[PDB]
Amino acid sequence: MIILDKVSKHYQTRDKTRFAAVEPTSLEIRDGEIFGLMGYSGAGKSTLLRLINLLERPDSGKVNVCGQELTALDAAALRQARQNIGMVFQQFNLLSNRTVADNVAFPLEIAGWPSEKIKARVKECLEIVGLTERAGHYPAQLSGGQKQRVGIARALAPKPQVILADEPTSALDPATTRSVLECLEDINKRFNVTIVIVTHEMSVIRRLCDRAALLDKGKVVEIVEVRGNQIHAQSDIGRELIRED
Amino acid sequence: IILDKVSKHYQTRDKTRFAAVEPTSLEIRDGEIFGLMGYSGAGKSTLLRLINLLERPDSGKVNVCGQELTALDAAALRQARQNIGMVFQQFNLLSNRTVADNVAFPLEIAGWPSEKIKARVKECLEIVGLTERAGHYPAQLSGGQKQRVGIARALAPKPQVILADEPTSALDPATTRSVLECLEDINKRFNVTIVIVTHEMSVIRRLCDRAALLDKGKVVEIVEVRGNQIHAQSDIGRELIR
Amino acid sequence: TFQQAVSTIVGMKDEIFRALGETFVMVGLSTTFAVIFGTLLGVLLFVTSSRQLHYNKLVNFLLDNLVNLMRAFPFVILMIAMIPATRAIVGSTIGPVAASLVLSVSGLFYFARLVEQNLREVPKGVIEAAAAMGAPPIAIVCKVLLNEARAGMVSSITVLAIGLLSYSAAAGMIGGGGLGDLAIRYGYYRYQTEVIIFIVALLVLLVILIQSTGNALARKLD
Amino acid sequence: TFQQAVSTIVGMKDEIFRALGETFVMVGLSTTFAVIFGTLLGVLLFVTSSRQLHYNKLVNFLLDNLVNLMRAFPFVILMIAMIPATRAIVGSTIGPVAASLVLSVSGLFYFARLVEQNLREVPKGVIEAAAAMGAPPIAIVCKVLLNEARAGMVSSITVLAIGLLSYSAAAGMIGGGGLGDLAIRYGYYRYQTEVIIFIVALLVLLVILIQSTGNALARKLD
């Protein structure tokens, strides 16, 4: 149940990074539902997802995650909290010089599990995505949809309470995009909550979001509830964002 | 603009992003906007190159605007390539010259007088509404402005055909709507017979007159999107439409 | 300190002004010929690998391997084996000009690799876009490649000049001229401080000056 | 004459073997220290460049300047100026081991430059995920960083080995370094043609063998 409170970021005039600035915003995501951060080319969505994880650090406010105020941890304690918040990336961010079973086993190895349990988990969370038939190959021998499945299966191996997804299926063609989203529905069966999925489009938002948020240049304008695969936006500048349907 | 027949099979060790195409024949009419559609690997991008005959086919004949391009010598082909405007997914525009110079580059190859080159470029910037940024350099423009410069360099030699290699794939919906209206205005005022590759049916519902659905390097069907609703008799066709 | 200053100024003002006069001619006359012939060779290394401007696998293979060999060979060994050939063209085995012939042959192959590397980083699309409008091959290479790699050549000639300065010091001992022919006199025999500190100080300042000039000009054009 | 030439070479049988066995002691011994210390130096350069272990800016500025300066500086001048310091450490100035110490010094800076450029080529996104999974900065430079760039370190070692071979010839004039000393006699003071072609052929063979082994090992690892 992530609750943010007057969080903000601004960058130097150098503006070396692609990420845009975010302005004071408070959002509460419930423990029983999936969320989504709609916007556009600059917007402020990508930095807002990193601010949940403190991979970007705010100038103000408190980031509260799972009942721990993460800006107060400021230590080797923070790198134990980041174990319970997983993440899947747009481009796949997979180690290329080790086999898929090891890519999946890498989070379990990092915590300090004995190898015997690591093997059982690598088997389980790898059959769940339906990829146990390719447990020996290398990322150079897989397709885009398969690489995204490896990312979901790595994200799931720490048994994380929250999974954060950054534009995961935008590159994928429609046939793969349906397969990767169906796998996310399978994840919602077990105790995995708040799968915040960032997207610069609406097809993904209507299909699997329970609630959604909209913005203009770092300022959230309106949060909607997606029922029967529609949106019914009340906001004015918001209506322009929804036309993407 | 007809392909009598064509094919190309890429030899291995070339590892090109392109995929092989098989015995296909097509007839884009005068004034028509015709869309090539298919998932990645359908071979739409390969089919587009074969028209300007950059990629040379293994066999068959390419008839563009009367001339048979396949039998032509290199010096004559350099005129056939000039006759066809092209735009690309990655902008592919020279970075060390100003917005005006990029439009002028095709006109200078054509050995045009320099006073004439000056007159046409101001007119071309006039059409794509970027006259104000004539002196700016291509590292200062947004993604949409870079595409609207690419369309102007394509229309500068007064072409009778344009080819479009999925130009809007990188653009958001708010800028995508403003560049598709430019291809509508160019077709309505000048009859340029534009051809277009894409992986999404949504752009076709916005722009095309007919379309070709490509699967594994062969056409399954030629649909009509003029009615504004794509309708497919086959099974593969009806899957791509969804 | 006056012992260092007095020693340096009186005796060494007669010798230092000769040694700097010999080092600038040894480097200046060699760099010009290396930039003028390395450009041509580096272009041929490229066009015969493009598939567009021209293609010929055999020539590409031969030229590439020859360039690799001549770049990996010890320069000092080549100069001492080339003394009769150098003595036929120059007419004399000793002098800055004689060391200048061997330096130009080593820079020629040295700069032919940098230009090709700079041309390989130009985006492939800008070549396909220029072939789309029927640009003749001699007009692609001249108006596209040598205008896009414009900012990459200047840094390349900055690295060649720093390279042919280090080679010049080695030449001064086998043959003649330079701060290398000065350093053996006050270092290998009669090891003498004061003068060795001055030789070390002058080189650092001159290396910094050439590097600063190269970066500023490259940044302007980019 | 052919038999006169070949008969001459077998007359030098003992000296040639000494030249080779003395060249290997200079290259084979300095490369180990170069790779042991340049690796640490390059890792230190890389970590202070990112948000891993630290983002010091002053330390990175100093270190980056230090390595550029100590690669720009000429090699022959450095050895002549290091005569007393080298003599004190080895107890001698003349000999292959004393010269190898100087070769190792230059090697650490060159290897660090190569390793830093290798590490700076891994995509940041893979390292970004390694931070999201709670791995401490030391774990980052051991499992995430090393696995991705190990295929490129072997190429760096291959280029370094050839780089130090060229320097050995320059130290040959002063340190009597095997083939470099052999080149100075029978090539300058005199000109024994049949023993010059032999040296050139032998060096070409060595260069080819090193390049070929390095390429194969680099290919098998990635």
Residue numbers in the entry:
A (entry chain D): 1 to 245
B (entry chain C): 2 to 243
C (entry chain A), D (entry chain B): 5 to 226
The authors write:
Here, we show that NmMetQ is a lipoprotein (lipo-NmMetQ) that binds multiple methionine analogs and stimulates the ATPase activity of NmMetNI. The overall architecture of NmMetNI is similar to previously determined structures of EcMetNI, comprising two copies of each TMD and NBD, encoded by MetI and MetN, respectively. Each MetI subunit contains five transmembrane helices per monomer for a total of ten transmembrane helices per transporter. Using single-particle electron cryo-microscopy, we determined the structures of NmMetNI in the presence and absence of lipo-NmMetQ.
With 1 mM AMPPNP (below the Km), the structural analysis of an equimolar mixture of lipo-NmMetQ and NmMetNI revealed that NmMetNI was captured in the inward-facing conformation at 3.3 Å resolution; no densities for either AMPPNP and lipo-NmMetQ were observed. For this data set, the two dimensional class averages showed clear structural features, suggesting a high level of conformational homogeneity. A comparison between NmMetNI and EcMetNI reveals similar subunit folds, with the root mean square deviation (RMSD) of 2.4 Å over 843 Cα atoms. As predicted from the primary sequence, the NmMetN subunits lack the C2 autoinhibitory domain. As a result, the interfaces of NmMetNI and EcMetNI are distinct. In the inward-facing conformation of NmMetNI, the NBDs interact directly. In contrast, in EcMetNI, the inward-facing conformation forms an interface through the C2 autoinhibitory domains, with a slight separation between the NBDs. For MaModBC, which does have an autoinhibitory domain, this distance increases to ˜27 Å. A comparison of these structures suggests that type I ABC importers share a common quaternary arrangement in the inward-facing conformation such that the presence of a regulatory domain increases the separation of the NBD:NBD distance in comparison to the homologous structure without a regulatory domain Figure 4—figure supplement 2D.
